[PDB]
Amino acid sequence: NATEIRASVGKMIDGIGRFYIQMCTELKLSDYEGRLIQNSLTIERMVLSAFDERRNKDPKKTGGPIYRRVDGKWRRELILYDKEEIRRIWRQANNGDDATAGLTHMMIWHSNLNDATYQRTRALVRTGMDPRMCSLMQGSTLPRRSGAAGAAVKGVGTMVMELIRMIKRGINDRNFWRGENGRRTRIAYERMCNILKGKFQTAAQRTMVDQVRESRNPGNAEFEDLIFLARSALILRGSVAHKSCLPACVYGSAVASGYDFEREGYSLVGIDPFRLLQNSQVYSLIRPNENPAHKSQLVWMACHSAAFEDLRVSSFIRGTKVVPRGKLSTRGVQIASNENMETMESSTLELRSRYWAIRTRSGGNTSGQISIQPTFSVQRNLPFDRPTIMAAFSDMRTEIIRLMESARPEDVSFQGRGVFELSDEKATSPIVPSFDGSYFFG
Amino acid sequence: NATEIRASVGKMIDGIGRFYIQMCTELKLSDYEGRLIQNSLTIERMVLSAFDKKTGGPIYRRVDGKWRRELILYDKEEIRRIWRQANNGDDATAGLTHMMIWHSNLNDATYQRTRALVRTGMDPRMCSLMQGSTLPRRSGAAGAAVKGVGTMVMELIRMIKRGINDRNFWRGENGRRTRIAYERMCNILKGKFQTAAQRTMVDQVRESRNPGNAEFEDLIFLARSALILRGSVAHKSCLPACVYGSAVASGYDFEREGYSLVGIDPFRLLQNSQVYSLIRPNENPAHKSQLVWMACHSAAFEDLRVSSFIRGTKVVPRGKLSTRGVQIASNENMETMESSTLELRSRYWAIRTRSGGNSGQISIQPTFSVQRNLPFDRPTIMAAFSDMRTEIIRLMESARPEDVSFQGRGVFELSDEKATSPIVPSFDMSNEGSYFF
Amino acid sequence: ATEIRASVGKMIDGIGRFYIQMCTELKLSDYEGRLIQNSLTIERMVLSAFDPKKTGGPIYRRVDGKWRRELILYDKEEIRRIWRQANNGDDATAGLTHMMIWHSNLNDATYQRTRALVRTGMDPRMCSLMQGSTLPRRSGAAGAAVKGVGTMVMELIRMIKRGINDRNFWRGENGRRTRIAYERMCNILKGKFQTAAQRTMVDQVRESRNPGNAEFEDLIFLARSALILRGSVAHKSCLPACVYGSAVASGYDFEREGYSLVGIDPFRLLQNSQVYSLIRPNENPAHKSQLVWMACHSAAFEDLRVSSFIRGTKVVPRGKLSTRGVQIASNENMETMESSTLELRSRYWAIRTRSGGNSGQISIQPTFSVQRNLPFDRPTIMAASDMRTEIIRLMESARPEDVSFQGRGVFELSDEKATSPIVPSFDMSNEGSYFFG
Ligand SMILES: CC(C)(C)c1ccc(C(=O)Nc2ccc(NC(=O)c3ccc4c(c3)OCCO4)cc2)cc1
Ligand SMILES: CC(C)(C)c1ccc(C(=O)Nc2ccc(NC(=O)c3ccc4c(c3)OCCO4)cc2)cc1
Ligand SMILES: CC(C)(C)c1ccc(C(=O)Nc2ccc(NC(=O)c3ccc4c(c3)OCCO4)cc2)cc1
């Protein structure tokens, strides 16, 4: 049954790979051009665009920039395709299945890339949220209705942001909560509360989300409750899925080598993506301004959903220093329409790493003794568990402040868990780091 | 007069030592065997048992390169007689009590008492309050000093329930004497509390005519309060008999020299003594060692950080401790049994306290531009700004886990006999972890 | 900015030159010139000269293997003269003030001042607020920067009480000039507060036309508040004159080279200078050393763990400190008096602050299953009309274990330009590392 999942993920990767190969054939891209991440992005965006039901209710066409190697120089062409031609090729590549999962996979890869490329300081202040809540904004770029995969991967902040957005619409325009489809806007609000509720790993945070969901007329008080909850999630962190989702060319490349993902199985959270990246070859266009090592770090972080991970941890796994966004001499992977193709060079993206680690959906949340009884006449504090003991007596906000105050930045999580060698396939022999400088953005 | 007490406890220790030597001679134990802590336990249990027609238990011998367990038997009368002879014809209640309290300290450090707590309607996380829960219900004044707030609540809950179920418990000639016992226990509990409010609530519970469900609820509330407004509980370093016996066999004169259960003396005695333990296949000797050390100093429910600092080695939580306890069961396999030196020494010593915590500087003014917290004494400063449960919740809510207690008090060097130069522990380079259980 | 270094340089030059001239006039040996007791006397002679029309004090001499304490006398005019010559005819008020602050720092580190505090209706536990309480009431701008909130409050209470006793203090032509003194002092206090609330309450006090018992109460409240919402108080490393004297004699050119009271300069100067001290028979030289070190760097009220870290040896509480103070009283026995080198060096340096403490990512979201702590910025996150009430609210909110000076580190003594901060890792649960109590 573990292997049933590996086979289905395997099948999904296969599909994306096949589709990528087919798209390279139709565009008559060389093997070199096919491994250009910029070309991967365009091909990806085209297929997603082709299925965007929302958007598609010519403008019956899709496209974007394709890049070509023309005597060792890079030339940008803008191409155009029929959404129904691309939808047709996608289904053929996926054996007639509609392969929603594969579409969602590529979405989640874009999201991870967005989370690693753009601080969302603008979006946060315009919502009345604190711009320092950016570690909470995983998946803030995904479409509002996404997979179950879409929801697993969204951050607590993303979910709060979406709920705030709705509450505000309702305050400005007092007809948002009404109409014939008022009942379905209401269920949408409750649905999002429950998603949020399910990310929280304490009774008190879960109870506060119940209060918010159950709110008759959601307004300014619920705004305030949600801001408080988002703040709390900076310390009592929510469970957020982390999925290593790679550009389509990498899967395409591997399928073209005769790699059989379905037979072999595949996991977004185990060794597989690390192994696949150890042996794949991806190029990127790169601006004269830009350090290739920095471009490389960007994609690496995106590939493993690591924007908001401790740079210490990221560095240790990677074997190269993973550097803060403020020290990073690169602007991001897509190339604008106004950029001059003539001074554009290209390098190999370093996407490998020293070790691997499993990806978690955990936030790090941890009878028995809850106080000390002093034995020795010695100057010190006398520890006790203030959240639990005082819990015996009136607000959710008070319980949560207590827990937040109880938590200490130096509390250790994931006790026993470690990184692994790329030769340690079955994750037998953890290597626990020792650490002495940790946030990507700030 | 300080030195009067030292002499008295010295005389008690002497007696235990002499008794132990005399038992080792009767059993023809080698010096190694005499320092086996399992042997010490049996000998201890025999003498206590003799004062509660035959008595005995497992004695362990090194025979043909192996540890052999034999089961020995003695007349209570013969053991009593040897005890009195060892103690110069005194009855030596105190010496009996001392061994009892050692057993208790060992029990407290070996076994969480989760079972007992839930069966009483008490929360299993109240185990820091359960010191001495294993002692017999009537023991010394020494007995009662050493018993925890939780132990005392548990005893009074047990008695309230007996009175509910059997409505003849509080009535008759029997009921005059059970009543005085209930009051006596309420006073003992009262005397351990260090706030007027907690004391008043114990007065209300005592003064209850017909103690039932309301008093039960008062007592659990009190116990819960004692997790923050902690009670006074005596801590006494009481060592296995073999250690005293060993010392006495060296010509140590406890009566002339004097002894203290709360100053340097047990730490000095442990620096230079040598105890062994049987040890099971899966067991780490350093972990067995930590167990006995904690027991010896009554430190089961102390902050592991404090215990580490004094000891000089990491004192690790019960859940991370590869050992199962010091007595060996009768169905255990003696063939797989090895033995090791218990490491019972320590880097420093500290005075043992009966206190449970709470001019002079009460704040720091930063001088240097350096990353750190800025201490101040929040209890004292905020103190500048009529139902008893409400008063107590107010105090609990005031308190903070990082409030400092025992201001000015610190550990000592083993060469600082007179307790001249306290050293305040810092826990900066130290790794976290406060609760043994 | 290099104009300031040059002017502080010029001031230091002057003190050094003056000290060298005074050592010549007294015919002091190299050794005697570097004796801190002789430095103190020469210092308080010059200060005294600018306060019969004689001045002087104890000068100590190494004569035939014995320390001889002789009393010298001088005309205030002669010493004023020498001072101005040394300072090229400037009247070097700043230099006089520098020495005053050194004596103040030495006072703060030697004496608790519990007497003065009760006699003003202040709490004797307010001693962390009493930096500079020994300075003259008017001492230049340097004087005022260095004075604590408590000192300021104490001086305003002194003035309120003069106004109560003499019910025409506030009144006439002399009542206009006492009024401006009061307002000046209120403004100095106001400027040290880093909250709107505290500042508004100082406005209320200043604007009182007839200050009495209500303003007293307001100022005690404010002093209590500064134990948690701390004032800005300058810290200035001011060394004994003999150190500067020594340095000038070595051909150090403080005016060309520049100098800072808050940067590396005083640490470098002390690292490589050599100061001696008389020491009584029951005194530990290491302890005397600590005292002088703390005074030099104005560290009396600093967290001992911070002082310990910078210094490289344990900086020990005042109660554990075997020394009685640097001056020697007239009835002390010179025959039993020995002398040692003060250990004034340190392992690192740290910038001195005038601060009191208190967008981007402020927390981590774990991506990999890997053992580690989970950083977040606790102070920032947790941070989320009657002035008294506003202040009590903020005092009650504050957490002693909040970190201040985030990112700020110590430096190597080679690191002039403060290039490479080394950030220590203190335990934030620790709120006990006070010099006094
Ligand atoms: C997240 C999904 C798509 C499954 C969803 C779930 C519920 C709803 C909904 O609109 N209404 C609703 C009403 C009550 C609840 N209650 C709980 O979800 C709930 C109540 C108690 C719980 C708990 C969940 O988690 C496990 C233990 O405790 C949930 C949803 C919408 C979407
Ligand atoms: C030590 C003094 C000088 C008081 C002394 C004691 C006993 C004797 C003596 O005549 N007999 C004697 C009998 C027994 C012992 N000791 C033990 O049999 C014995 C005593 C204590 C033991 C032990 C073995 O095992 C290890 C430590 O605990 C020692 C001497 C002579 C001097
Ligand atoms: C600590 C007391 C004095 C209570 C004590 C300790 C151990 C014993 C004991 O049974 N044996 C024992 C063995 C060695 C020693 N002590 C020393 O070897 C010793 C003790 C102190 C010393 C010293 C050596 O030299 C360095 C510092 O001063 C003391 C007792 C008896 C009494």
Residue numbers in the entry:
A (entry chain C): 21 to 77, 88 to 396, 403 to 429, 438 to 480, 485 to 490
B (entry chain A): 21 to 72, 90 to 395, 403 to 429, 438 to 489
C (entry chain B): 22 to 72, 89 to 395, 403 to 428, 438 to 490
Recite the paper's sentences:
Following increased insights into the importance of vRNPs, antiviral drugs that target nucleoprotein (NP) are an attractive strategy as NP is a highly conserved multifunctional protein that plays an essential role in infection by all subtypes of IAVs during the virus infection life cycle. NP was reported to interact with RNA and oligomerize by self-interaction to form an oligomer to maintain the structure of RNP. In addition, NP is essential for viral transcription and replication; the major role of NP is the encapsidation of RNA into an RNP complex and maintenance of the conformation of the RNA template in a suitable order for transcription, replication, and assembly into virions. Furthermore, NP or RNPs participate in translocation between the cytoplasm and nucleus with the help of other viral proteins and host factors.
Here, we characterized a novel influenza A virus nucleoprotein (NP) inhibitor, FA-6005, that inhibited a broad spectrum of human pandemic and seasonal influenza A and B viruses in vitro and protects mice against lethal influenza A virus challenge. Three FA-6005 molecules were found in each trimer. The third one was around N224. We found that in the presence of FA-6005, mutation of residues in the I41 pocket displayed high resistance, while that of residues in the Y289 pocket exhibited more tolerance to the compound.
